[PDB]
Design a protein around this ligand. Sequence first.
Ligand SMILES: [Cl-]
Ligand SMILES: [Cl-]
Length: 162
Amino acid sequence: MNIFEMLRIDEGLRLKIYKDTEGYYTIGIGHLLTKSPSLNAAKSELDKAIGRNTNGVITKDEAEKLFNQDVDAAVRGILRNAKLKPVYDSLDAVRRAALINMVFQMGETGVAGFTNSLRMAQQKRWDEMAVNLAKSRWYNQTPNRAKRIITTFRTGTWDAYK
Ligand SMILES: [Cl-]
Ligand SMILES: [Cl-]
């Protein structure tokens, strides 16, 4: 199992513009296009992202290319973040994947916001962190996914995804 497979499981894959769990225009493998309620604005963004006139549809290869960029960006975003870097550096390989995932879904700013869970992660207090992560809007809005990430952090294994 790895980060790509893991996120592909959590986000799915759609070749047409769609609305996420929060109502935002998205496409491919969890690629957020815009927060604006306008479909046109979403279409413009998509064309701009792909480099062609898409008419709201992409191909699998195109989806994957956006995905690659997105993972890379997430990783890099974590590494440049003062609050995130240290955490990431302290973790093992599976848990790092859990952190990348959260960053992918919610942005660097959002995760940097889980201050208390981050501190617990650094102290390697697994069960406490899992309780703390649960007390969040994130967990209340997308509980199944959150559960998967939580287990991952708690156990340091890919059991939730097998
Ligand atoms: Cl982009
Ligand atoms: Cl969910």
